[PDB]
């Protein structure tokens, strides 16, 4: 899932590729059609 080179993996993004959650058809669909913002996790701001 590290969208970058192996040597500098930590410098690249994380979670870009995830394991498809095959727990129930609805979950599969939701997963295949999901988004994710690059903003840092748990940011103090609340506009985004």
Partner DNA sequence: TAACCGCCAAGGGGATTACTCCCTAGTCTCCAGGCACGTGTCAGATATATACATCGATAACGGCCAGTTGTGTTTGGTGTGTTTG
Query: Which positions lie near DNA, rule CB under 7 A?
Result: 38-40, 43-45
Q: Degrees (nearest 5) of the Cα angle 23, 25, 27?
A: 60
Minimum Å gap between C-beta 44 and DNA is 5
**In this complex, which beta carbon is closest to DNA, that of residue 23 or of residue 45?**
45
Partnered with residue 3 across adjacent β-strands are: 13
Minimum Å gap between C-beta 46 and DNA is 11
**In this complex, which beta carbon is closest to DNA, that of residue 10 or of residue 22?**
10
**16-25 as b/e: b if 16+ CB within 10 A:** eeeeeeeeee
């Amino acid at each position: 899932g590290n969208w970058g080179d192996q040597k500098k993996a930590h410098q690249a993004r994380a979670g870009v590729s995830q394991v498809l959650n095959r727990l129930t058809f609805a979950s599969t669909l939701s997963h295949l059609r999901r988004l994710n913002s690059p903003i840092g996790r748990d940011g103090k701001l609340a506009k985004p």
